[PDB]
Design a protein around this ligand. Structure first.
Ligand SMILES: CCN(CCC/C=C/n1c(=O)cc(C)n(CCCCCN(CC)Cc2ccccc2[N+](=O)[O-])c1=O)Cc1ccccc1[N+](=O)[O-]
Ligand SMILES: CCN(CCC/C=C/n1c(=O)cc(C)n(CCCCCN(CC)Cc2ccccc2[N+](=O)[O-])c1=O)Cc1ccccc1[N+](=O)[O-]
Ligand SMILES: *[C@@H]1O[C@H](CO[C@H]2O[C@@H](C)[C@@H](O)[C@@H](O)[C@@H]2O)[C@@H](O[C@@H]2O[C@H](CO)[C@@H](O)[C@H](O)[C@H]2NC(C)=O)[C@H](O)[C@H]1NC(C)=O
Ligand SMILES: *[C@@H]1O[C@H](CO[C@H]2O[C@@H](C)[C@@H](O)[C@@H](O)[C@@H]2O)[C@@H](O[C@@H]2O[C@H](CO)[C@@H](O)[C@H](O)[C@H]2NC(C)=O)[C@H](O)[C@H]1NC(C)=O
Ligand SMILES: *[C@@H]1O[C@H](CO)[C@@H](O)[C@H](O[C@@H]2O[C@H](CO)[C@@H](O)[C@H](O)[C@H]2NC(C)=O)[C@H]1NC(C)=O
Ligand SMILES: *[C@@H]1O[C@H](CO)[C@@H](O)[C@H](O)[C@H]1NC(C)=O
Ligand SMILES: [Cl-]
Ligand SMILES: [Cl-]
Ligand SMILES: [Cl-]
Ligand SMILES: [Cl-]
Ligand SMILES: [Cl-]
Ligand SMILES: [Cl-]
Ligand SMILES: [Cl-]
Ligand SMILES: [Cl-]
Ligand SMILES: [Cl-]
Ligand SMILES: [Cl-]
Ligand SMILES: [Cl-]
Ligand SMILES: [Cl-]
Ligand SMILES: [Cl-]
Ligand SMILES: [Cl-]
Ligand SMILES: [Cl-]
Ligand SMILES: [Cl-]
Ligand SMILES: [Cl-]
Ligand SMILES: [Cl-]
Ligand SMILES: [Cl-]
Ligand SMILES: [Cl-]
Ligand SMILES: [Cl-]
Ligand SMILES: [Cl-]
Ligand SMILES: [Cl-]
Ligand SMILES: [Cl-]
Ligand SMILES: [Cl-]
Ligand SMILES: [Cl-]
Ligand SMILES: [Cl-]
Ligand SMILES: [Cl-]
Ligand SMILES: [Cl-]
Lengths: 533, 535
């Protein structure tokens, strides 16, 4: 019909009508927002997509940016749900727009979703990122982009104009500029753009908070299980150049301009096959090509920008899942597998500490062991497994988020914190993993409402609940319903009270302290210990 | 009576019949076991008391060794109860013997009590150490002694024949030799001597464990709220000389040099040395004392920590325990914002400064680690938690963790170890309520002081003390506190390095618990030394 044809600043589009149990949604999938970054444009910042003739087939997702594919458990849904579902291509800078079927007459707020994957993987075309239910239920405009991952998005030879780094973040920013100029044609309100992302997508959201050229592109932010001040999310110029030159050596390509020009001659798959080989040691929850602290996108380290920053006028929604680092362990930690109880020995535990906490002195590992050992049950395998699951989760996700939330709130921002702790009825991972990293996204996106999936009807109510929390934050900067002050109130997170909410099948429950005892070790004591040994 | 006259190897003695609600006891108070360590014999090891003509008036307590007196809270019971209740004199090397009035026909085990007080105070003539009710109710011989304290017993110029150090411990050893020679004359069995002491007395007991010449003088040991491996109980030869030369300087003794320096100290009157005792301490401290046993290579061949890891401990019954609030009352002697009359709700800025006075001579990084473990980062400002937290800091760092460390190594090397936690607050307690069960207030119940009619203890505090005296006496006889053939009684299990089992001591029956502040002592005993030798 006529609702599926819209015209943006670059040309004409033809969308597709998507069906929801509660009605239809208008979807425009695979809108080009950048000229294909190929050949000489590899490793380079993106160029805005020049105008085109005719109409663009916007009825299906475009290609996935080149990335490593998980093959640890072949055919296992717990891993396959994150693998690409389209063909790999460097011609992948495309975005998507969902909008309610009766296109909103009044400007409706906009959610922009930035995906995770340790800056090495991810695609907006994944099924758990389907935004038809989130739009049909709450009547907002949802936008999701693809950004270059791996060396294609974050390889950096700092200083050189040919490999400047952070171009995957610049892909996101260009997509945000596109929203400022074109979301109005879909009913979106360019004055109510709320960024929300998970894992590296959440860390990416934190980057745009600390980057002035991005700050005028969105108004509020949601950081799900990720923060830019995490140990995995940023790398120094010295190590970034070390990892890039190590890749050029492994691929046969060893000044700076000579190095990059050779790398552009290698097929994209050839670089992907040597990605994990540039890491400085055997580790878990570490990724090769991540944003670099270079002085452009980030004037300083994310930690420094966070402390000295003024965040008045900012509303932030942050949170974690119950068991963040559980499934990371099966990717290199001794004695761990998704297929047994992973009841590890203490020798395996002490060895696993060095894998979860790499590039760290022997004394600091002793400090980690002292805090996470039950010295009445130092050998109990079950306690030891949960301990290492806490070591990885707290060090990489929880304590980075708690450090950011306290700093933002105590420096002008209005922060709301959560802990998603509902294990899905469909979860294919083992039971000892609990609620693993990334398994709140299905409910945030209202995937339970899909009839073809056998979520419990009580889980569908849970999904619609969470969808309202997010939409309420997007509209007002407050997740609470101003309609119903009888329902349990979600209080703001503060540096002192440290109040947060538990999200599960039960009604809201206010808890205090976001692992406050453990995160005092990671954020306060451990830096002093490394700075003195 | 005939029971009040006995002949010891040095001469004759005239004793006293003492009265208890349950019966009488013979007691011989003020027996001279050493020649008076006065004048030129100051700072020197003791010499055996020369035999005497006629009888000795063993009917009243002898003097108290020269020591500091706690003038901090004049007339306060909790303070005055430990202050000396006899004339101060350097002529103080005397001991006392309690024995049942029907003098035992069979050889009976002997309990030897060593008082505490940071090696600077204490006396066997205190009311809390009265041996009537323990000897009457359980029919064991009890012996206590006076040993030199302060600089008189522990001033050390390492390497000099004039101030060789540890002479206060040599006083104790001489008393134990006297018990070996003479306790048989009172019904005591020289082959069943059990040492029990508290605070620095318990530390002394553990040092007799680690000193071979003392090892043939007893068979069992009880350490109450003290350990030889504490940070306060020993001192290095270099620091020992540094503290002693400064004392000579502060009394106008111009600093062979060592022979001159001691001879000048021998001239200054006794009270002058006491007045300048706490001034040789290196910095602001709490639970830290000036003149303590020195690791000189004689009495202590090595550091007590070293002697404990590789010792001769198999076939040794040891009783060990602490009170619930070991460090509470120390804080009022230097921690900012603390007083017995106040409620001591300190600010965090006072907590941080009080940490560095309870844990002195540590790096700033070490103090940061203490703050990390003992802060409640969900309520880091609450003055009520900060008050209890600094109590735990001083309590763990000085008593609990050194004691748990001792119990573990003894058990792993073949010692039958029994551990307790005394968690009953006395109704008579003069200290504020927030101090809980403070350091030293299990002694009254172990000695059966609740049985004194002139005291206003509960009727249940009376059956409590009779149960503790039973535990201690059963240990002295058998090396096992619980009753021999007792079906219905919560059995007291031995302490082990793995299970770490101990019992709670209060009006409620024996509750068996595991872990003697294990999470906290892992920091003090394991990680903190690594961090201290890596900065
Ligand atoms: C054993 C021999 N092999 C080893 C490589 C295989 C393992 C790669 N490996 C790691 O070592 C470490 C880590 C941390 N990880 C990331 C895993 C995280 C979970 C992924 N998760 C989906 C559940 C995705 C996700 C979804 C949502 C949010 C966030 C995330 N997220 O955070 O990822 C790894 O994959 C070497 C080799 C030798 C010759 C040729 C080729 C290779 N070679 O290299 O294959
Ligand atoms: C209830 C009775 N209790 C006594 C409580 C023990 C508390 C320790 N306590 C004291 O008793 C007395 C005093 C005076 N103080 C303070 C001395 C430290 C300050 C020195 N400071 C000044 C800047 C440093 C300095 C000085 C001079 C020059 C330069 C510098 N400088 O460099 O700064 C204390 O701490 C006896 C007891 C009874 C039974 C069992 C065990 C015990 N028992 O005792 O355990
Ligand atoms: C639990 O599983 C781990 C994971 O490793 C194995 O798990 C098996 C179920 C099997 O599928 C095997 O192919 C898989 O690799 C076990 O650790 C492994 O133990 C084997 C020896 O039996 C070693 O050869 C492997 O290197 C080792 N893997 C790692 C990562 O260390 C583990 O033994 C098993 N049991 C327990 C109690 O943890
Ligand atoms: C809790 O009490 C302590 C000390 O307790 C006593 O101190 C006496 C001087 C006397 O006033 C008596 O009534 C009191 O109970 C207090 O510590 C002292 O407080 C004063 C007040 O400004 C300071 O000048 C001192 O420096 C300080 N001594 C220190 C820090 O060692 C403490 O303030 C008090 N706390 C309260 C009342 O909240
Ligand atoms: C880096 O690459 C080679 C390595 O030897 C070196 O010759 C480059 O210098 C040349 O510089 C010229 C000046 O602009 C340029 O026109 C030329 O293209 C370039 N050579 C090549 C092969 O690219 C070095 N370039 C630098 C340092 O900018
Ligand atoms: C459960 O879901 C799976 C796939 O989501 C489907 O194949 C199966 O038929 C469902 N079960 C039922 C009873 O419908
Ligand atoms: Cl469909
Ligand atoms: Cl056209
Ligand atoms: Cl499977
Ligand atoms: Cl509308
Ligand atoms: Cl260049
Ligand atoms: Cl730009
Ligand atoms: Cl950072
Ligand atoms: Cl700061
Ligand atoms: Cl190292
Ligand atoms: Cl165990
Ligand atoms: Cl268990
Ligand atoms: Cl505000
Ligand atoms: Cl399972
Ligand atoms: Cl809570
Ligand atoms: Cl915690
Ligand atoms: Cl700090
Ligand atoms: Cl009397
Ligand atoms: Cl005489
Ligand atoms: Cl005669
Ligand atoms: Cl010397
Ligand atoms: Cl023995
Ligand atoms: Cl010194
Ligand atoms: Cl306790
Ligand atoms: Cl508080
Ligand atoms: Cl509270
Ligand atoms: Cl509590
Ligand atoms: Cl009171
Ligand atoms: Cl039993
Ligand atoms: Cl503990």
């Amino acid at each position: 019909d006529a609702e599926l044809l819209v015209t943006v600043r670059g040309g004409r589009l033809r969308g597709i009508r998507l069906k929801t149990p509660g009605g239809p949604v208008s979807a425009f999938l695979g809108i080009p927002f950048a000229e294909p970054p190929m050949g000489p444009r590899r490793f380079l910042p993106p160029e805005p997509k020049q105008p085109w003739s005719g109409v663009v087939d916007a009825t299906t997702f475009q290609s996935v940016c080149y990335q490593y594919v998980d093959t640890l458990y072949p055919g296992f849904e717990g891993t396959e749900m994150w693998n690409p579902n389209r063909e790999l291509s460097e011609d992948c800078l495309y975005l998507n727009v969902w909008t309610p079927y009766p296109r909103p007459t009044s400007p409706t707020p906009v959610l922009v979703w930035i995906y995770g994957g340790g800056f090495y993987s991810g695609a907006s075309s994944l099924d758990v990122y389907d935004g038809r239910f989130l739009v049909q239920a709450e009547r907002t405009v949802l936008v999701s982009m693809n950004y270059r991952v791996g060396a294609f998005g974050f390889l950096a030879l700092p200083g050189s104009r040919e490999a400047p780094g952070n171009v995957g973040l610049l892909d996101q920013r260009l997509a945000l500029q596109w929203v400022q100029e074109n979301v109005a044609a879909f009913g979106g309100d360019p004055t109510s753009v709320t960024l929300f992302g998970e894992s590296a997508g959440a860390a990416s959201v934190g980057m745009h908070l600390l980057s002035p050229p991005s700050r005028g592109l969105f108004h509020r932010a949601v950081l799900q299980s990720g923060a830019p001040n995490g140990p995995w999310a940023t790398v120094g110029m010295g190590e970034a150049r070390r990892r890039a030159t190590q890749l050029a050596h492994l691929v046969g390509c060893p000044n700076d301009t000579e190095l990059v020009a050779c790398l552009r001659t290698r097929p994209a798959q050839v670089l992907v096959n040597h990605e994990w080989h540039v890491l400085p040691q055997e580790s878990v929850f570490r990724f090769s090509f991540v944003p670099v602290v270079d002085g452009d996108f980030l004037s300083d380290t994310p930690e420094a920008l966070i402390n000295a920053g003024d965040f008045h006028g900012l509303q932030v929604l942050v949170g974690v899942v119950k068991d963040e680092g559980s499934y990371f362990l099966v990717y290199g930690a001794p004695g761990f597998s998704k297929d047994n109880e992973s009841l590890i020995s203490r020798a395996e535990f002490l060895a696993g500490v060095r894998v979860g906490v790499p590039q760290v002195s022997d004394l600091a590992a002793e400090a980690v062991v002292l805090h996470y050992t039950d010295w009445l049950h130092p050998e109990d395998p079950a306690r030891l497994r949960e301990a290492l699951s806490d070591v990885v989760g707290d060090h990489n996700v929880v304590c980075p988020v708690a450090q950011l939330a306290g700093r933002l709130a105590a420096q002008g921002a209005r922060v709301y914190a959560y802990v998603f702790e509902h294990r899905a009825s469909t979860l294919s991972w083992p039971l000892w993993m609990g609620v693993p990293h990334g398994y709140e996204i299905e409910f945030i996106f209202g995937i339970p409402l899909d009839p073809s999936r056998n979520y419990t009807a009580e889980e569908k109510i849970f999904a619609q609940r969470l969808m309202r929390y997010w939409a309420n934050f997007a509209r007002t900067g407050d997740p609470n319903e101003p309609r119903d002050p009888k329902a349990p109130q979600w209080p703001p997170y503060t540096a002192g009270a440290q109040q947060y909410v538990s999200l599960d099948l039960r009604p809201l429950e206010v808890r205090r302290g976001l692992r406050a005892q453990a995160c005092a070790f990671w954020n306060r004591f451990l830096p002093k210990l490394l700075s003195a040994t």
